[PDB]
Amino acid sequence: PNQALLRILKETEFKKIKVLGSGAFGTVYKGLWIPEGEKVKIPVAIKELREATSPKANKEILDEAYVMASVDNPHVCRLLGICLTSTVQLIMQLMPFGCLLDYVREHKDNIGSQYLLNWCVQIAKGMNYLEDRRLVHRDLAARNVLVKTPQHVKITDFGVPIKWMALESILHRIYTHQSDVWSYGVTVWELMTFGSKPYDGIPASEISSILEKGERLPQPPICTIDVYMIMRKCWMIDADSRPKFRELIIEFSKMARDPQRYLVIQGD
Numbered sequence: 489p490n491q492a493l494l495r496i497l498k499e500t501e502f503k504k505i506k507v508l509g510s511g512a513f514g515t516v517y518k519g520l521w522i523p524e525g526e527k528v529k530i531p532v533a534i535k536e537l538r539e540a541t542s543p544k545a546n547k548e549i550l551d552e553a554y555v556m557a558s559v560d561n562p563h564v565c566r567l568l569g570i571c572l573t574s575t576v577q578l579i580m581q582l583m584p585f586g587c588l589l590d591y592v593r594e595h596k597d598n599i600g601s602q603y604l605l606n607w608c609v610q611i612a613k614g615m616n617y618l619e620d621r622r623l624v625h626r627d628l629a630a631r632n633v634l635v636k637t638p639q640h641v642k643i644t645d646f647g648v649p650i651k652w653m654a655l656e657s658i659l660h661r662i663y664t665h666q667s668d669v670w671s672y673g674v675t676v677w678e679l680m681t682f683g684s685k686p687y688d689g690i691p692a693s694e695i696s697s698i699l700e701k702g703e704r705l706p707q708p709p710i711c712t713i714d715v716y717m718i719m720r721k722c723w724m725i726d727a728d729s730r731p732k733f734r735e736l737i738i739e740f741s742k743m744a745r746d747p748q749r750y751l752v753i754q755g756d
C-alpha cells in the first residue's frame with residue numbers, strides 16, 4: 489500500500505457547506521478542504537457514510553481506502569482523503585456537472601453523437617483500468633458516472649440495482665469483470681436514450697424472468713445496427729461471449745472517429 493497517496497484528514501481540515509444529495513449509504517456535501525500548513529482552500533465533495541452499529545476495523549477501512557487512493561486513471565474517481573471518526577467520511581474532488589444520468593436528461597436536446605460516443609469510450613477506459621487493477625465495480629450505471637466537465641467523465645461509487653445486473657449476478661450473486669460488461673451495456677443504453685429508465689414499467693422482481701425468456705432492452709432510436717449489436721453482445725447469457733472492455737474501447741474509439749455514421753440524431 490502506497491500510504492502517501494491517501495491524506496488522513498482531521499475533522500478540522502475540511503468543512504461541509506452545501507448538500508449535494510443524501511442516500512441510503514450516506515450524505516454527500518460540497519465543501520472545502522483546508523489542509524494544515526498550506527495556504528489554500530480546495531473545493532471538494534465530502535461523502536459521510538451512515539454510522540455502523542458494528543464498524544469494520546479502521547485498519548480494514550484504511551486498507552480499502554488506500555486502494556481507492558491508488559487509482560490513477562482520468563476516467564475513475566480517486567480518493568483524495570479520508571476522515572475516520574464515529575463515521576467514515578470520504579473526500580474527493582468536486583465534479584461540478586453532477587452525475588451523467590442527470591446531465592443527459594437535462595441537456596438531451598443539445599447532445600450530439602460525438603459527445604455520446606466519447607462518453608462511451610471514456611467509461612470503457614475507466615472500466616478497463618479497474619479490471620486491470622482486478623477491481624470489480626458491481627454497480628456501473630449512468631447515475632454512477634460523474635461529469636467533471638461535459639467531455640471529461642469519471643466512474644464513481646465503488647469500493648439492489650437489478651435492472652443493471654448480469655443474469656448470473658441476479659440468480660447466483662456472481663460478480664465479475666464480465667458481469668460489469670453487462671452493466672456497461674445497460675449504461676450505454678441509458679446514454680443513447682438520453683437517460684430513459686431501463687425496462688420502464690417492469691417491476692424488478694420480473695427482470696430475471698424476461699431476461700431468461702430472451703428479451704432485452706430495445707434498440708434506441710438514434711442507434712445504428714452496429715452500435716446496438718455491441719450493446720446486445722454485452723447481454724449474452726454466456727459471460728465469456730460478451731465483449732471485453734479492451735475491445736469496447738477500440739470499437740467505440742473507431743465510432744467516435746466518424747460519429748454521424750453510427751448515431752442518427754436530429755441536428756447531428
Ligand SMILES: *CCC(=O)Nc1cc(-c2c[nH]c3ncnc(Nc4ccc(CN5C(=O)c6ccccc6C5=O)cc4)c23)ccc1OCCN(C)C
Pocket residue numbers: 508509510511512516533534535556557565566567568578579580581582583584585586587588589590630631632634644645646647
Ligand atoms: C445521478 C444522481 C446523483 O448522483 N446525484 C448526486 C450527485 C452528487 C455529486 C454532485 N457533484 C459531485 N461531485 C463529486 N462527488 C459527488 N458525489 C459523490 C459520490 C460518491 C462519493 C464517494 N466516493 C466514491 O464512491 C469513490 C470512489 C473512488 C474514489 C473515491 C470515491 C469517493 O469519495 C463521493 C461523492 C457529486 C452527489 C450526490 C448525489 O445524489 C446522491 C444520492 N442519490 C440517491 C441521489
